[PDB]
Amino acid sequence: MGILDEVWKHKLILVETPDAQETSLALETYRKACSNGRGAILLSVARGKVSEGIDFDHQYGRTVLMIGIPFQYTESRILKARLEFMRENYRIRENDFLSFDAMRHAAQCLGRVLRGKDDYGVMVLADRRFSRKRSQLPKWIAQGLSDADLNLSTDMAISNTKQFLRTMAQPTDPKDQEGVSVWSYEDLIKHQNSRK
Amino acid sequence: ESPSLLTVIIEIAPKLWTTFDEEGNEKGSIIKVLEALIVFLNAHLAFNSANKVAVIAAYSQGIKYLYPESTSDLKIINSDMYRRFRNVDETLVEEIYKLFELEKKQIEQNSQRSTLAGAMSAGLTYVNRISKESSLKSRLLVLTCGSGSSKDEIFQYIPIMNCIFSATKMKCPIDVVKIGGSKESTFLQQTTDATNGVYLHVESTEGLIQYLATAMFIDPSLRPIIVKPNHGSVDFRTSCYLTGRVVAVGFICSVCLCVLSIIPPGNKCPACDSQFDEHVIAKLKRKPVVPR
Amino acid sequence: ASLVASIVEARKKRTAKKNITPYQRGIIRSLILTLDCSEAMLEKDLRPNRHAMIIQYAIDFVHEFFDQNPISQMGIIIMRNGLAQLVSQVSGNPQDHIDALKSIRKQEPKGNPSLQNALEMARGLLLPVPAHCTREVLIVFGSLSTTDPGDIHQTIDSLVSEKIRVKVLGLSAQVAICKELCKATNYGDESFYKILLDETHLKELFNEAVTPLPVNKINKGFTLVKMGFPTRIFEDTPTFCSCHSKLVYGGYFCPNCHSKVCSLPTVCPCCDLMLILSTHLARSYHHLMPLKTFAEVPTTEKFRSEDCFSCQSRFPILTSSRYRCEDCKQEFCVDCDVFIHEILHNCPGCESKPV
Amino acid sequence: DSLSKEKLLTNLKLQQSLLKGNKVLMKVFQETVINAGLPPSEFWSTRIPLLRAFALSTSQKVGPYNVLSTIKPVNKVNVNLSREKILNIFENYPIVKKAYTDNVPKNFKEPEFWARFFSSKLFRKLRGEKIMQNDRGDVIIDRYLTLDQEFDRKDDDMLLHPVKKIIDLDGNIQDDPVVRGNRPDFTMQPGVDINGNSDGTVDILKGMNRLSEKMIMALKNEYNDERNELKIDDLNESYKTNYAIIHLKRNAHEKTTLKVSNQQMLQQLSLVMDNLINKLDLNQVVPNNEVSNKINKRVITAIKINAKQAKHNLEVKSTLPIDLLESCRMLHTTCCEFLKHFYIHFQSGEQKQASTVKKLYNHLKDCIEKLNELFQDVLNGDGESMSNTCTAYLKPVLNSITLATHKYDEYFNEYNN
């Protein structure tokens, strides 16, 4: 369709190569592109080599397009034998374990955005079936996941993201966080006495 | 066209009025001025039916909102005159007598600062108030007794400049009437020229009725079709900070920006203590190099 | 219950303006506003479109800058189609740049930006500038990216070395490279990469950018400067001017080399010395002499007066709207507080009170 | 580089370039050096910022961009070629530049070449189009296919570089060289075709990655740290301004270049309060019509004087002959130029400037005599009908010029004599 030609006009596009070395050159390119601020896009597998020890932060971790449920390949006899064995052992529901693993891989994908509290980012869930899984999702992740956010479309996703960018583009008075989020030594002392 | 909000500030001070009437002999010249101003406000409020008048007097210790009465009964004037004219004139003569009685009461303390700039500023605030309410022409009138001792206009200079800038923002000409021995008042003349105001100085208290009835009648409804009658011209120069004389070409601080007719002693700023560069001032002191 | 929200909003506002300082702030300014006129500002997303409002706001910015600080020269370079185009040299006449911006009105914004080229030729234009002049650039930006020919970091290093500061007013959101520019140029400050939230906020930001900026102690350039007050003549005969070479009825006369000019505050074209009026230098004295904030006295305590000291009106009565000048010990209304703090630049209570 | 005063004075071609750009600059320069013979370096010495601005305007260049992605295929096709974009294609693809330069100046035409190019499969390969044997391409352009392939190999060889271990995924996957597990999924591994060969999507993805790398190395042109990289700034001290406040000591000099008594003012004050409470008559304010007549005389005199001031409220309309008007404007202009350069020499203040000052003094004297001879010409052309106005129009620049001559003579007598 030539959509990538349109995408060229705004940012670079980087794709996970099967070569880890070319992938390393690619991520260096992405790093330098976000360094000069001309902007770039990374394309990596949910279980791909990027996802297991590379973090992204404050320009690198800004927004992530997670694509659907990262389910494993369904017709693995190896997987089915695993499911049978673990169900026989610990009485484990097979589909629930599959959702668990999908689940946990998605969290591993999305956990590389917020390095410090100064950072900010937006998360997407690009599948219909995710709405039943907030109870599965980790607690601090899902605590920001509001109930209105459980089923959204592109339009209000865009509007909310623009408003989030507008929000994060503002400074903040230190008084609003000087005792509730950031703690001085005296703050820790006061808290310790309050515990006492 | 539109009601012209009339703004009249009267600088009353016995230090000036006593000096003037002892220099001359016209006792009650201030009373003559007040009666003339009464006829002037009558002529103004008969020129237009709603061209409202703000009257404020600045005494030795401060200012007073003369017209109108505060937000918180003899009749010297005649009963046959107009209703609104009579109300305003009775109110003003009552306020004037109250202020003069007060001035007699607290005469013996000393305040050496002129309050003209503060009176002008407060009048301009009231002009903002009136114009913001409900389109109204802004025209500011000052009456001063210039025969008194010109003590120090230096501290008066800065807020006068600020008032000039404000009136420039507000399209209000500042028209100056001076009675005194000194022919010239440089800051007032500069004020009139910058604000498109009218400067005038005479001495005799007689004939001020004809003077400020003829000349001092220009309204913004007809300002461009009336030539200003001012004859003096001002260089807009200031006296030096450490020698006190006006300078044509000179030096100013990069920080304090005060005029230096000469090199400051110690090469440090006499206003904000900035030590300067010796090579810079040596280049400033450089004579031209001429062939033999 | 709206007054409680207004009170807490005023408190959170006044927490920023609690600290008022008499910093040395630049007077001999050198301000550059570069414009991008690209495909991004073709968005009608804000009414009527970003190009039209930045044109109008730049008109206002030119007027305000020349009114407040007439002791600087103004240059504008537009950015268009991968090229940065100079349209306005630095000059004392704002009307030239007004006409150039009027030309920019009718032409069509299109293309892509290059901050590298823009800042490079802005540097080159800022190169022949005397030491006392404070070289600073306002940059407006609507893209989230920048196509560039080469490195920006060498340009950043050169700009820092040549003592020029920048302030970025981005449109959509924060761009990390612009944050980097603002931080590194601005001694680590983050108070220069600003993003609007609506057009009113953009207006407020432009008004904020009007003001002079404080200078740093380490960036010390304390010196003198030669100055000359000229004299105005009003001659019967028209006379040739030195600048535009045409017959003039009036005109100031040069104090040094006795030539004539057509406009002020300008430098001489002949003896080549700056000519001003004392009004022009006193114009920034409110910046030189700042005004303290005025405090509302609480409604619980006993009151010195119940009506406004300055405008002479009754104070309204839950809370107490009596803004007190502690320097003159007089309380005032909110209208007078606004006028004295913004329009006026003196306290008449302190004028009446003898020192 | 081309930034020094010497470089800007040296670039005679650029000087001629903005000369040819302007027209009043031919007028001024022609009078300055063609007519008056001034040193043209000193001519350009004033216009140095203008020269540098013109140079920097001419000197900028655009950044790289995906010109083939901006190429659209657009029934029939009509070529609508843009020369700047043609050179953009040339710069982005030296193979396409080479294929142009060995075929169009040898075999056929440029629009024919570009029609063949758009027809060619090499164009599709270089763009984001998968090659297909169903497409025939252009044979002449597609002969360069293997040449472009070995260009790609050489460029990839150039693009290879060592990687930081902090981000090295190759070191990450070389953590355990004896991983023995199971073969990973066909889903999540790079898929192939039926006959085991690839479709080539890995080729197109590595190609666009090569385009990105070529971008970023074009950026990376001529024109330890991990300690700084791993700093956690969020728990650090806030930056505070070192801006210096300023005070102001206040001691101003009094203005340079009888005294009343409390008893006497109190006596007068008592008397005037007595008069105040005594009486006040509006009717007595009417004057005596004689001193009032003198007031009328003074007021009317002020009106007449200021009205004559206001009587002399594009330039003004004048009844000059247009040629003589232009000639006198020209003379005024070159005299102003001479005066400004003489002031530049004088305020410079060097013994090296001495001969320059003397020669410009001679030129000013010559301009004076030429002004006088022009006055003789308008003398015997008008009979001083409006030659008076000519003299008065050229007067003030002459006065300033001769004042400068007197200043030069005075300083000559100061130093030499």
Next chain:
Amino acid sequence: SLKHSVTQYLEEIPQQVQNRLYTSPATCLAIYRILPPLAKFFIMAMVFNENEVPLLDLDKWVNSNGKLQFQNAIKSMKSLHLLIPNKSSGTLMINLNPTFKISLRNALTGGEVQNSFGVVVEENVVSLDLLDEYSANKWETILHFMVGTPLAKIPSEKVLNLLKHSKLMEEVNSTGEFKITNEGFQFLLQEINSQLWTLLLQYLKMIETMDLVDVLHFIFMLGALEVGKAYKILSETQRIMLQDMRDYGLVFQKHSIFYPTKLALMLTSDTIPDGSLIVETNFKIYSYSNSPLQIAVLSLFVHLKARFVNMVLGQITRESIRRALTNGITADQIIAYLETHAHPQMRRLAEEKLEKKLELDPNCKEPLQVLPPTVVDQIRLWQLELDRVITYEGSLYSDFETSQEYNLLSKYAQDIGVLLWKDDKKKKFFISKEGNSQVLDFAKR
């Protein structure tokens, strides 16, 4: 044209009768109020010195930019016989009317007024409760009488006769009913001081000797009078027309002490808003105004629905439009009311559209109507579709020869104001029956 009408009337008044009018300070004060700013300045300057001036000094003082306005001021000054310009010593020696001068001087000084400002009793009472209420009552009665909605309190027989004689709100004796003339609707459109001044101009025109200058001086001092006080009951002609204007409700008289209401003040001078109406393409009325008078006048040309607190609603029908048209009421009068009853939001939108169309084209290829033509031109199209013909009836001269002669005779009729239509191309023109004899006599000669 109120000042124009009064100035025209006083110019019709002869020189010595004008000088008699210039005798008293109250009349001089009111007339000074009438004068334009330039002449006002001239007389306040010259009033305090007995120095006559030549015209040359004034001309040298006058900036030539407003010289036309200066000419208007001095033309009024001379034509009112307020000036005595004589060419003394070859120079047009300028002299103010001296009686006017001294009476203005005494008024300004508070000197001899001879109670021209009023024979005062100064028994002040509350006016909002008696004077204003009786005034509003009597003015409401005459106003709804002039509307035509039924009201019991008929006006005076003097004003009834003046309406019968005058072409204002025609009491058509064949019908026996007051009927809205186009002049009546002009009076309805008029401002309140305009209505008062038209009434007094008509009453002064009809009244004869009743001393005319007594009525003039009394009218001027009555305008000069102030509210809410008792005064002495003076001339007897002034007293009897004072009782007449008492029956008009202007003054609250207790048959000798009389108490002038606010109407004297409005006669002297004037003092999403009220009276602002939102137009609708559906012809709906969203008035930001309400009064029973408002409903009474809207009944003539608007189909209404109901009355609420400020919200008067309705829908303009073509039946209402043609009801206005058939009364002889002008569509220009209708749009005079409409364009005096516009609303802020809609006029801001109209100005925004005007500034949008300014940059596209100067003509815009649109009809010239600033009020939004989506609703406003619908009436204006109905306005053009109302009249849409030209009728010529009576005599007609045809088949001229020489064009010369046709232009001469036609031009002569235009000069004397008896030409009603002409056509160069047919060499024909139509003249009024009144001018027929004059044109024929000129044709023979």
